[PDB]
Amino acid sequence: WTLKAGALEMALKRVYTLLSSWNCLEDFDQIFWGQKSALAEKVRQCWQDDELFSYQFLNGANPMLLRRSTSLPSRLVLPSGMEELRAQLEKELQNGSLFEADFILLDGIPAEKQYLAAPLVMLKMEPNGKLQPMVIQIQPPNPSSPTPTLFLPSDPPLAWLLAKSWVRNSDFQLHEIQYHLLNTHLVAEVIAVATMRCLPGLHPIFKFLIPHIRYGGHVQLLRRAAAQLTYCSLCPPDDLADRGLLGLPGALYAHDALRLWEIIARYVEGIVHLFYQRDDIVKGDPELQAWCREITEVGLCQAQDRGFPVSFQSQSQLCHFLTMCVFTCTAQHAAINQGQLDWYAWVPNAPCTMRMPPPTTKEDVTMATVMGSLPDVRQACLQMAISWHLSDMVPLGHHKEKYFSGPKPKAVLNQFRTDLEKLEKEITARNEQLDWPYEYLKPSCIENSVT
Template identity: 80%
Template sequence: MSGGGNEGGCLWRPCQRRLHKGPLLSCPHRTSDPPTPPPAGKTASPGTLLLSLRVLVPQEKEFEHDIPEDLGPLQFVKLRKHHSLVDNAWFCDHITVQGPVAFQEATFPCYRWVQADSVLCLPEGTARLAGNNALDVFQKHREKELKERRQIYCWATWKEGLPLTIAAGCEDDLPANMRFHEEKRLDFEGTLKAGALEMVLKHVYTLLSSWNCFEDFDHIFWGQKNTLAEKVRQRWQDDELFGYQFLNGTNPMLLRRCTSLPSRLVLPSGMEELRTQLEKELQNSSLFEADFILLDGIPANVIRGEKQYLAAPLVMLKMDTSGKLLPMVIQIQPPSPSSPTPPLFLPSDPPLAWLLAKSWVRNSDFQLHQLQYHLLNTHLLAEVIAVATMRCLPGLHPVFKLLIPHIRYTMEINTRARTQLLPDGGIFDKAVSTGGGGHVHLLRRALAQLTYCSLCPPNNLADRGLLGTPGALYACDALRLWEITARYVEGIIHLFYRGDDVVRGDPELQAWCREITEVGLCQAQNRGFPISFQSQNQLCHFLTMCVFTCTAQHGAINQGQVWRAESPGP
């Protein structure tokens, strides 16, 4: 049995094993007492071991529990935490029972908090489909578990027209098993405090000494310094770094190869040479675009009584023979009745005008990166997967066991975002141009464009024409990680689903699929999301998307925020 002392994560370590005449239970736990036998007059039901423990301090113990009769293969363990004066909750990892015969061992996963006078009924941990239970008691346990979970994990509407979320007004309202462990909480909150302190100190510095030249920009780089920060400081104005960001920066999801010149790119008279250059690059398949049209018409925020501004730029880029992606022209806003031929900015323009145009692009990239590709396409999607998993798949289901390590902490981190970053009057409203309601409009537009294929790198990169693009490190790594994840998923799924008919006949799996598409994602079947699984391949592809989105994709979109090259304030 493992638990208690590991506040930062699950303990996946082997317990000591010895052979005894009776079953041996190995348990790291918070207790200084031997196991308490069942009360007088009570005996364990056949095939089930009933165990009660008092939890006091973190430690690991191994003890022998003699049982006079042969129980046969153990199917369940009931775990009870006695009430005490200091009623601390106890996080139990697992219980391992070693029988009298070599290799006769049973493991009962828990990985839950044991609270108050509660009793947990833990089945033996081998994954099973609903129709593969030799004992009817397993089916009853699955049904009881899901009934209880549906009462605990409820859907809620955060904003109309957006994916549903867990019903929790704040992190304290979340189920205990979805909360940060102490080590994670301290690390998370410590990082926030350190970042906030650095921002305050820099703000005070800028109040005392305003910027008058670009050299003053160096002042923001004091504090945590590294090689990357120094490189950004030296090259943040370069066109080469500007183009590189679209391939491998914080947001590598917008760039696409052109198959024709964009209709919004209106070239006025006098720019025939630019048109010729664009058409030449187009013929060579070396012309790319980054279109921020999703921002067009989004209402801008008002911060401290001052109206903010939002651009919806278009950037045309070329890839030269050395593999460098370089900007050719920037259009800040699309054509409109009041401006049918909006101004264009070129690298040959005065340096400050060209730099200002690039700064507006980076500002717009911040808005789409944070809201569309980070919040919606990873965080909110992962939360839908997490809530549906807890509501529809019992702990014995192989898909539950496959997914649960990848959706850990999802509900708390998202709840904190909704209560700290995104509430009315929160950080987004106080500091970001799309705050004050514009962010909700943008998320709704982004959801309308969110397709199943767009979440799968082989489809997404092919659609954007980036397969085989020189220097596209994100694209290369995403494909490799997708393939690795797919092989892992297929290996697990083929152990339990020996044919397409088994997939179609799994009621828990089919309910989970519908819960995601029809409920959590608000009828997303018209955007390619499945409402049922008809084959092994279809199931494996969907699960690969789930795991990839919650792990590799979020890492690619999130971790780059440590340094955002040449990005002005939001």
């Protein structure tokens, strides 16, 4: 249950075992014959469009990587005689308009033989709202490349596509290992056990948390991910702030996540201020304090060097942490998981595996090269299988149970529902006006727990 060695290696096996059970004709019709999503069908036809490539960094299956650059990455070595790329990256950084998708956590991992790369994409945002790519670097510098080729939108079309496609494969990897398995599922397992371990069932925050938690490499990558898991990464206000995605009107994941955070927060602090009336109570609850330590020190593996608390000194310190717990188990899993059907069905747009190494030049890139690198029918079709299965339930805030008895808690949970209905009708109204709606965080679509 920990994030050790170790435990993480056992996690991946249990995941393969689950996925294996869908390697059969279980929903074959549905699947490979039935109607695919409206968005899936949109992706199929626009996937080569540079804007659709870019757009996904904001509102696709994985909107957790993109960042607004403050300086140009040290890995982005620009060869002599690209004064123009130089000047344009400079222009954008000075304008506060330069963004990046840096896939470095993959650097150095090897991957039935699959090839990995650790690319960097630099994108500009124009007043429009729209993100346009400027340059892809597929491998980082290292000490016999010196100056990795820089692939550009103006290059031989099939080279630009191969470059982009490697970026999507890399996005596929980080998305599933880091942002889905680790950050939602495995962090959920830590929260869950630690609740079971340190808090008796009638402990108020056990009652609060419970409706949300019943119950090679890869290995390399998952270990590194778990290594750099910070507390702020799991908190939208912090996270969207640390990545410069605040004040971005077309950042719909960002908007929705943040608007949910405020709902969860208000619901959280409402319940907390009832039981822990004042900071003194929080500080003095020894069980809660064990529960905190159990998550940060044991479960997350000495995670107190990555923003995580070792104690709760106050209501605010506890509400912030309790809001992170709900969000991780509910909203964020919704955001990370609900998009596989839409974005990963059309396999060329999110290739699960690449079967050749990345190109070192932009020269001699052929359909043979492209088709050779992209997955095969078997890999690609099993991809589609799993993504459909992944993407009856109890929605967020609707645990048809009453662990709390008073009218005071009931009022709190009642406002939560009202605010959730408020966001619901807001999201659905916005989405109606858009060709590319975002709906992985509509409150009704979020399950009251990771399952």
